[PDB]
Scaffold this active site. Structure first.
Site, PDB file in Angstrom:
ATOM      1  N   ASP A  16       0.817  -1.204   0.000  1.00  9.44           N
ATOM      2  CA  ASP A  16       0.000   0.000   0.000  1.00  9.44           C
ATOM      3  C   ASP A  16       0.854   1.259   0.000  1.00  9.44           C
ATOM      4  O   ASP A  16       2.000   1.249   0.444  1.00  9.44           O
ATOM      5  CB  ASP A  16      -0.970   0.033   1.177  1.00  9.44           C
ATOM      6  N   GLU A  18       0.738   5.760   0.372  1.00  8.91           N
ATOM      7  CA  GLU A  18       0.122   7.064   0.583  1.00  8.91           C
ATOM      8  C   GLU A  18       0.953   8.091  -0.177  1.00  8.91           C
ATOM      9  O   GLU A  18       2.178   7.994  -0.225  1.00  8.91           O
ATOM     10  CB  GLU A  18       0.070   7.413   2.071  1.00  8.91           C
ATOM     11  N   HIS A 174      -5.966   6.184   6.630  1.00  5.06           N
ATOM     12  CA  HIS A 174      -4.987   6.975   5.887  1.00  5.06           C
ATOM     13  C   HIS A 174      -3.563   6.486   6.121  1.00  5.06           C
ATOM     14  O   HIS A 174      -2.601   7.101   5.659  1.00  5.06           O
ATOM     15  CB  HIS A 174      -5.113   8.455   6.250  1.00  5.06           C
ATOM     16  N   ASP A 179      -3.749  -0.067   6.074  1.00  6.39           N
ATOM     17  CA  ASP A 179      -4.413  -0.514   4.852  1.00  6.39           C
ATOM     18  C   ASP A 179      -3.786  -1.792   4.307  1.00  6.39           C
ATOM     19  O   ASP A 179      -4.490  -2.695   3.858  1.00  6.39           O
ATOM     20  CB  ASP A 179      -4.380   0.576   3.778  1.00  6.39           C
TER      21      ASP A 179
HETATM   22 MG   LIG Z   1      -4.423   2.574  -0.921  1.00  7.65          MG
END
Ligand SMILES: [Mg+2]
Ligand SMILES: [Co+2]
Ligand SMILES: [Mg+2]
EC number: 3.1.13.-
Lengths: 208, 207
Positions: A16, A18, A174, A179
């Site tokens: 994942d 950000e 977030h 995640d």
């Molecule tokens: Mg994502």
């Protein structure tokens, strides 16, 4: 059986990311989490190694205000404990190559929710860091949005996990690490449930 | 058993493209096929409407000789009955919107093998043509490579189809229409078996 038998040699790595925008080429990478997977002896899939990094914006990187306002990340915070894109990916690539070899797989495939988004950023960063021998497949991915669509009838991560009986703390939505973990458990659940119901291996359905 | 209930309101449309390169922004779109799906009363999935087009290269488009040599397409052949990206996409969107309303869905999602590739080419053509109200989701897709990886332990389209007991003719692998029909049948076979083995609906397992 073996992990190497499950996806024709692909070593699935949950990833994942950000970011500070939608554009992998121009926008900064701010966070990246990585979770390798492993199969026990009865062929059940589960998370193996977990990595996570706060990432420094590459020099010349753009930062979209709305992106920051959304994920709540402030790259200028000196207490971020941030590392360079090279350092993060080099550590992830190292672990992944290890797993690929140990598992007898031929290379890695990124598992992610709307995978292309995360794939494009990770690959772009790897390119910026001049990383050699990127273990990941250049364009192949396991999109859990699609998988969850099939398995659970849901394409949104939080609803997918919920429908799957998993907890989901929107408070941590977030966070790349969070995640990635939820997505790893989700993916493992989807694959295992397929084996549980006699979808895998392909000979199971008839052997009853 | 309703299609609109299967994927939280998403209208799955199978799509395949043939191109003159790897770059959706710069390279020409040469072929596009579209196959809408429908569910019978018992909730089984199957192909509905089928569209297929040879596409004119948009003016100013690059054409990689490597791509042409691979797919065997000659964009200069006047007998290929090509249409503009507008014609093709406008017709598909019309058909797709009708399917969306008729089935009670709210938006369409592209089903493709390594879906990001086709999605990016279709979306780019849509923008070039200034099409309004694109019914497709702007970033969500149902990649059959990943689904076949789950359901069949295979990611290559041809091998995935074979494993699923489908025929696959390499002779036709370079045709958008052919790939789209095989992929649609693959997707349906995957969705239908998940249902037949008791995976769907979610309540089935405890019955
Ligand atoms: Mg994502
Ligand atoms: Co911090
Ligand atoms: Mg294709």
């Amino acid at each position: 059986t073996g992990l190497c038998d499950r996806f024709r040699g692909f070593y699935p790595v949950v990833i994942d990311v950000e970011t500070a925008g939608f554009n992998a080429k121009t926008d900064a990478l701010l966070e990246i989490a990585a979770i390798t997977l492993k199969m026990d002896e009865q062929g059940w899939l589960m998370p193996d190694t977990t990595l996570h990094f706060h990432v420094e914006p590459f020099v010349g990187a753009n930062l979209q205000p709305e992106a920051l306002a959304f994920n709540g990340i402030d790259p200028n915070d000196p207490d971020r404990g941030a590392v360079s894109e090279y350092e993060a990916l080099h550590e992830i690539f190292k672990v992944v190559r290890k797993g690929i070899k140990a598992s007898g797989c031929n290379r890695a495939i990124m598992v992610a929710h709307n995978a292309n988004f995360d794939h494009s950023f990770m690959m772009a960063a790897a390119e910026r860091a001049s990383l050699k021998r990127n273990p990941f497949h250049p364009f192949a991915t396991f999109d859990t949005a699609a998988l969850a669509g099939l398995a659970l009838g849901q394409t949104v991560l939080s609803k997918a996990c919920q429908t799957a009986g998993m907890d989901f703390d929107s408070t941590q939505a977030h966070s790349a690490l969070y995640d990635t973990e939820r997505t790893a458990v989700l993916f493992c659940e989807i694959v295992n449930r397929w084996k549980r119901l006699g979808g895998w291996p392909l000979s199971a359905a008839e052997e009853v």
